[PDB]
Design a protein around this ligand. Structure first.
Ligand SMILES: [Cl-]
Ligand SMILES: [Cl-]
Ligand SMILES: [Cl-]
Ligand SMILES: [Cl-]
Ligand SMILES: [Mg+2]
Ligand SMILES: [Mg+2]
Lengths: 674, 676
C-alpha cells in the first residue's frame, strides 16, 4: 500500500528508486514559491516537492474580479540546485537545466523517517528499521530578508545527501532567469560533540573544507508493522512514557521550532523532529555563499516546549544548568497503525472513532506567535495539537547567547469552546485566568486498533455537507477552515488534512494567552479565513446566521488505503498512477494571499491541492470579534498553470486572462487512492 | 530666504508650477517608494526627495559584499504617484508608461509650510497668520501587496493630495520595465468624523463610487506669512500641555503615535504636528480599493495613541467608550521663530542646550515602540518627539476599529540607556530592572534657537577620525554613525543627514527594552545594532574589544547659517548646486540598505545622508548587541541610485552584472549644497 518517498539528486541526474520500490514519476525539485510577497514551501520529503514540468513560473495569480494574471508581477520560484559552479550572470532558457535538481517519487512498503545525530556521528536506524541513505541535517533557508522556510526534522527532506552552502537557486518568474544571490543563506543542524550540556554555545567561524565536520549527520530509515511514529511530550523535567501498544524509539528534549534570520519555523509537536536527543540554545549554524559558516556569532533563536517551573522572582534570563528545570522532555514512539487527534471545540472530550483506541486526552493547542518573526503552529490532526497540560506560556525562547526566558510578545493560541447554538453568534469578549481550563477545547489522541487508519477530507465548496465515498466510513462533518490570523501571523490547516474540517463554526475559534497567566477571547483584532461556497458575492459584510451560506462544509472519512493528488500541469485530467483509482477530479490549487501577512498554501500531493470547483476567490475573511465576514480585493488565489504550450525552460509570457478563459489556463488534477 | 523648499505633485502628466515669488529649483517624477530586496523604503511626498529628475522603472543598483553589484537582476519594484489616466488591462511598457507617472516641482519658499487636517468634510482654515497654498484630501497610508507599503507624515504637505484617487500610485516591475495596477493595491485616507462623538464606537460603513469623496477628511497646505517653524508637545496625561515661552499656540489635540493598517505600523513623529489630532477616534481612517469601494472599520486595523499613566483595570479587559478619555494623552502644536532640537546625554545628567539655544523642557530619551508582526514606530533622535517628559514602560496604547483600546503583551518600548564613557566598546552587562528604571535611562533636553534659525548638519567620516565642520558652521557635538537599531526584530533607522544618526557614545546596545508588568531589560534578549563603517579592512571573523573602534564611522553635528540639501545627478557627473546655493561636499547617491532578517532602511533623497563621500559596497557593520562583537555578513546589501546617463526615460532596464573595477562608474553622484 502506497507510502510515498521522494528523493532529490542535487544534480542534473534523475535519481532512482530502490529495487522493489515502484517509481511513480520523476521531476524537478521545488523548494518554495514566493507569490505576492508570501513564501509557500513544499516539504522536500513529500511528493509535492517533485514537479514533473519545470517553469520559472508554474503558477497563475487570480484576483477578486474574474481576471487572472500570468507572469504579470514579480513572483519567484525556488528549486534545489546542483553541484554546478555558481555563474556570474543569471542563466536563461536551457542553461537553467544545469542548475535544477531532479527528483523521483517512489512507493515504499513501510513508513520512512529521518533521524539526526546532532553530531559528526552518522545516526543508526532504530531496531526494525533499515537505512536508505545518509546525509546532512538541512534545517532552514532564506533567500533574502526573512523570506524562506524550513524542513520538518522527521521528514527525509531534512536529510540531504550532499552538503551545499547554497543548496537552492532563485528564479525570477516573469524574466525566466535563475541566479544565486549573496543574501541566500542555508541553516544546518550543528555538530554538538562534547559540548557542555546547558552551557553557553561556543561560537565558531568555520571556512571551506572544515565546514562538513561541523554539520549534524542524518540517516533516512525505512521500517522493516508499517512503523508509524509520533512524539509525546511531558511538559516537565520527567521523561514521558510511550502509551500502551507503542514502543520507545528514543527520549529527548521538546523542540518547538527555530527562529533564524527573523523567520520562525516550527517542528510539529506530533513528529519526531520535535524530540531532539541533545538540548542546546543554538542547535544550528548559518552557511553563506562564500563557503563560510557561523555558529552562534549573530542573533538567532530556538524555541522549546517548557515545564511549569516559574520564572525566578528577578525575572532575569535563565542560563547554565538551571535551564534543565525549564525544558520539557519527550519520547518518540513507534506504532503499527496511524495516530490522529480529534478536537471537540467543547467541554466534552471527544471519543475515538469506532475501531480506534485512546492514547491520551488533553487541550487543543493551535499555535504560538512571536514579535515580527511570525509564529509556529500545529496540524489539528497531529498529536502535537493535543497537549496534555494547558499552559498560557507553553514555549520558552532561547538564544545563541546561551540563555532562555519568557519574553512578553510570546503568545499561545488554543481552540475555544463553541456551544452549538453559539456558532453563528458574535463572539463575546472575555478575559480569563489561565487556570480556567473549562473555556479550552478538549482533544483526544487515538491510534487505530488490517486498516492502518488513513483519513480523507472532502470540501463541498457549498452549503451542503458532502458524503464519503462508498465503502469509506464517515468520522465527522464540519466547516472548511483555511487559516487563522492571530497576532498578525497566518497559521493554516492543509485542506487535505482533517484539521481543516472543524465540527463547529465561529468567526473566532481560538483564544490567546499571554504573560501573567491571563487569557483573552475576542479581545484584540484577529480574523479567520474559511473556504467559501458558490453563493453570489455580497455587496457588504454578512453577519451572524447569514454567514452560513458562505462557509464550505466538509466531511472526514476513514479509507482503506493511501490517497494523493496528481497534477497534469495541462488542460487534461491526469490519470492516476498505475494501480491507483480516482476519487475526484478538480483544479490545481497551490497557495493564497490576503490582507497583511495573510497567506498559505497546499502540499502538492495533498487532496487539498485539488479543488473540484475552480473559484477565483475560494475563501472568505471573517472579522473575528465583529462576527462578520466579507470578500476583499486584497485576496489572491494561486493555481498551477497550464504549461501545455511551453518548453521546460521557455520564459513565461505575460497574459491577462478574462472571465470564462480563466479555467482553460489552470492545471487539472485527480485525487487517487491506492 | 534660507532655502526652505516646497514640493508639489501634479498627479498628472503635466509638470506643475511654483507659486508667486517661489523660485523653481528642479522638476521631476513623483517617487513614492522603492521595494528593494523585499524591503519598502518610502520618500516623504512633501519633501524634495520624492521629486526625482530622471525616471526609470529601476533607478537603483544593488551591491553585495563579494565584489559584485547587480543591476536589474532580481525582482525589485518602484512605486510612483500616478495620474488620472484610465487603468490599463495589462502592464504598460516603454513610452506607454509616461501617461501614468505624476510630475513634480521643487520650489524655494520664504517661510515654513505645513498641512492641516480637519478630520471632517470641511476644508480646514489655515492658522491665523498663515496663508493657503492648496487644499486637498488627507492621504495617510498605502500598501501594494501584503503589508508592503508606507505612509505620510500628517504635518507634511505630502499627506494632502489635491486629487482623491482610490489607487493614487502605480507599481513598476524594475527589470521588466513595465508598470501596472494590481487588485491588492490599497490606499488609506483619514475619515470624515463630522457625525460622531469622539469616544463613541466607530460606526462601520461600506462606501461606493460617488459617495466616497464625502467620507474623506479634508486638508489645506499652509505657508506662514517669523518663518513659523512648528512642533508638537505632549502631556502624557489628560491635561492639555502649554506652549513653552517664546512660542505660540496653534491648536490643541490628542496624541497620535501611529496607525497599523494591513499589518503595517506607520508612526507619526511625536515632534511633528501629525502627532496631534484635533479629534480622537479608535479608527481615524478608512481603506479604499481599486474597484472604487471604501470600507470604514469593517475589517481589522488599528491606531496607536500616546497614553496617560491611568492604570489598566485589574480585570485586564479592553477599555471602551467614555472610559477611553482617561487613557489618551493630550497635546498642543506651537509655532516659533526658530527651529527645535533634542539633545541626549546617554547618562543621568540632563544635557545643557548649546550656546545660543534655550531650554523648553527636559525628559527621557524615547527611541521606539515595537509590536508583534507589524513592525514598530520610532522617533528621530533630533526631534523633540524623542524627548518625553515622563518615563513609561508602556507609553503607547493600541486601539481597534472595534472601538476599544488596551495594552497588549507584545507592545514594547525602547529608550536610550545610560552609556558611560568607559562602557564604550565593552560587552554590555545584562540587567533586568523591576525598579529604579531611571538609573538606566538617558536624559534629554529640548532646545530652541534664541537671525540664525538653528539649522543642524551632520557629516560622517566613514573613518575612525572625527570629521570637521565646514568653516562658518559651529560644531555642536561629535559621535558615532548610527544607521539603525534592530529591536524585537523591527529595524528603526536614523536618517544619516539627521543629527539623530550621530550618537555621542558608542555601544553595541545603546537602548534598553521595557514592557508589561513594569519591567525593563538591558541586553536580555537578542537585539543588534548597525553602524556606518570605516575604510578599515574586512576582518576574517567577528571583531571584539579594542578591534571594534577602527570599524565604527565617526560623525560631527554642526550648526549651519542656511538650509542644506543633497542634489543627485543620476549620472556619473557631479551635479551642480542650484542657483544661489554653494557646495559643501560631493559623493555617491546612497538610497537604501537591507540586511539580515527584517533589517533595512533608507535615506531621504534630499538629505545629506543620501550623499556618502566614499563608495563602499558594504558601508555598514552589524554589532551583536549582547555579545559585544561586530562583523560583516553576506546578507548585507547596499542600494545606490543608478547612473542613468545613457538610458532613455522609459527604456527597459538592461540586466547587468557589474564586477569590482567598474562598480563606481555605475553609481549616481551627488553634491550637498547650502543656500548661499
Ligand atoms: Cl510574476
Ligand atoms: Cl479578537
Ligand atoms: Cl531587479
Ligand atoms: Cl539583547
Ligand atoms: Mg493586527
Ligand atoms: Mg530576533
Amino acid at each position: 500500500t502506497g507510502i510515498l518517498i521522494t528523493r532529490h539528486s542535487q544534480s542534473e541526474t534523475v535519481p532512482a528508486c530502490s529495487a522493489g520500490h515502484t517509481e511513480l514519476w520523476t521531476g524537478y525539485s521545488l523548494l518554495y514559491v514566493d507569490g505576492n510577497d508570501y513564501a509557500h514551501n513544499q516539504d522536500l520529503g513529500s511528493p509535492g516537492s517533485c514537479v514533473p514540468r519545470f517553469s520559472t513560473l508554474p503558477v497563475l495569480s487570480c484576483g477578486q474580479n474574474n481576471v487572472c494574471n500570468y507572469a504579470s508581477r514579480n513572483d519567484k520560484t525556488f528549486w534545489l540546485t546542483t553541484n554546478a559552479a555558481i555563474p556570474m550572470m543569471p542563466v536563461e532558457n536551457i542553461e537553467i537545466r544545469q542548475y535544477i535538481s531532479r527528483c523521483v517519487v517512489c512507493e515504499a512498503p513501510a513508513n520512512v523517517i529521518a533521524v539526526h545525530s546532532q553530531t559528526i556521528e552518522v545516526p543508526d536506524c532504530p531496531n526494525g528499521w533499515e537505512g536508505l541513505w545518509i546525509g546532512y541535517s538541512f534545517l532552514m533557508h532564506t533567500a533574502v530578508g526573512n523570506g524562506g522556510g524550513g524542513q520538518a526534522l522527521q521528514s527525509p527532506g531534512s536529510c540531504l545527501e550532499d552538503f551545499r552552502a547554497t543548496p537552492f537557486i532563485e528564479c525570477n518568474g516573469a524574466k525566466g532567469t535563475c541566479h544565486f544571490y549573496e543574501t541566500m543563506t542555508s541553516f544546518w543542524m550543528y555538530n554538538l560533540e562534547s559540548s557542555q550540556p546547558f552551557e553557553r554555545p561556543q561560537q565558531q567561524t568555520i571556512k571551506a573544507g572544515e565546514r562538513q565536520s561541523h554539520v549534524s549527520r542524518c540517516q533516512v530509515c525505512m521500517k522493516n508493522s508499517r512503523g508509524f511514529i509520533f512524539a509525546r511530550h511531558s511538559q516537565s523535567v520527567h521523561v514521558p512514557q510511550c502509551p500502551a501498544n507503542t514502543n520507545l524509539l528514543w527520549e529527548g528534549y521538546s523542540l518547538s521550532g527555530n527562529v533564524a534570520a527573523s523567520r520562525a519555523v516550527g517542528q510539529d509537536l506530533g513528529q519526531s523532529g520535535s524530540c531532539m536527543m541533545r538540548f542546546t540554545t543554538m542547535p544550528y549554524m548559518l552557511c553563506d555563499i562564500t563557503n563560510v559558516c557561523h555558529f552562534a556569532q549573530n542573533n538567532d533563536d530556538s524555541l522549546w516546549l517548557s515545564t511549569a517551573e516559574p520564572m525566578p522572582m528577578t525575572m532575569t534570563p535563565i542560563q547554565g544548568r538551571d535551564l534543565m528545570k525549564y525544558i520539557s522532555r519527550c519520547v518518540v514512539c513507534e506504532t503499527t497503525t496511524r495516530i490522529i487527534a480529534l478536537h471537540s471545540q467543547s467541554m466534552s472530550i471527544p471519543d475515538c472513532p469506532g475501531g480506534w483506541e485512546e492514547m491520551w486526552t488533553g487541550y487543543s493547542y493551535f499555535m504560538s506567535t512571536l514579535d515580527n518573526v511570525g509564529g509556529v503552529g500545529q496540524n489539528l490532526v497531529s498529536p502535537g495539537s493535543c497537549l496534555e497540560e494547558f499552559r498560557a506560556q507553553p514555549v520558552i525562547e532561547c538564544h545563541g547567547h546561551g540563555r532562555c526566558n519568557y519574553y512578553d510578545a510570546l503568545a499561545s493560541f488554543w481552540l475555544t469552546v463553541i456551544e452549538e447554538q453559539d456558532q453563528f453568534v458574535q463572539p463575546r469578549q472575555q478575559t480569563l485566568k489561565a487556570d480556567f481550563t473549562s473555556k479550552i477545547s478538549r482533544c483526544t489522541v487515538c491510534r487505530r486498533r488490517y486498516l492502518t487508519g488513513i483519513l480523507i477530507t472532502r470540501h463541498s465548496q457549498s452549503e451542503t455537507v458532502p458524503a464519503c465515498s462508498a465503502g469509506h466510513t464517515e468520522l465527522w462533518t464540519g466547516y472548511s477552515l483555511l487559516y487563522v490570523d492571530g497576532n498578525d501571523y497566518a497559521h493554516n490547516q492543509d485542506l487535505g488534512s482533517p484539521g481543516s474540517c472543524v465540527p463547529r463554526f465561529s468567526t473566532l475559534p481560538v483564544l490567546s494567552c499571554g504573560q501573567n497567566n491571563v487569557c483573552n477571547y475576542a479581545s484584540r483584532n484577529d480574523k479567520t479565513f474559511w473556504l467559501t461556497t458558490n453563493a453570489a458575492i455580497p455587496m457588504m459584510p454578512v453577519e451572524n446566521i447569514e454567514i452560513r451560506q458562505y462557509i464550505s462544509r466538509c466531511v472526514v472519512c476513514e479509507a482503506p488505503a493511501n490517497v494523493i493528488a496528481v497534477h497534469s500541469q495541462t488542460i487534461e485530467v491526469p490519470d492516476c498512477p498505475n494501480g491507483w483509482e480516482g476519487l475526484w477530479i478538480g483544479y490545481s490549487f497551490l497557495m493564497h494571499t490576503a490582507v497583511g501577512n495573510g497567506g498559505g498554501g497546499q502540499a502538492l500531493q495533498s487532496p487539498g491541492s485539488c479543488l473540484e470547483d475552480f473559484r477565483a476567490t475560494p475563501f472568505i475573511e471573517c472579522n473575528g470579534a465583529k462576527g462578520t465576514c466579507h470578500f476583499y480585493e486584497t485576496m489572491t488565489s494561486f493555481w498551477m498553470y497550464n504549461l501545455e504550450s511551453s518548453q521546460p525552460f521557455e520564459r513565461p509570457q505575460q497574459q491577462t486572462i478574462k472571465a470564462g478563459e480563466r479555467q482553460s489556463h489552470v492545471s487539472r488534477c485527480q485525487v487517487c487512492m491506492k
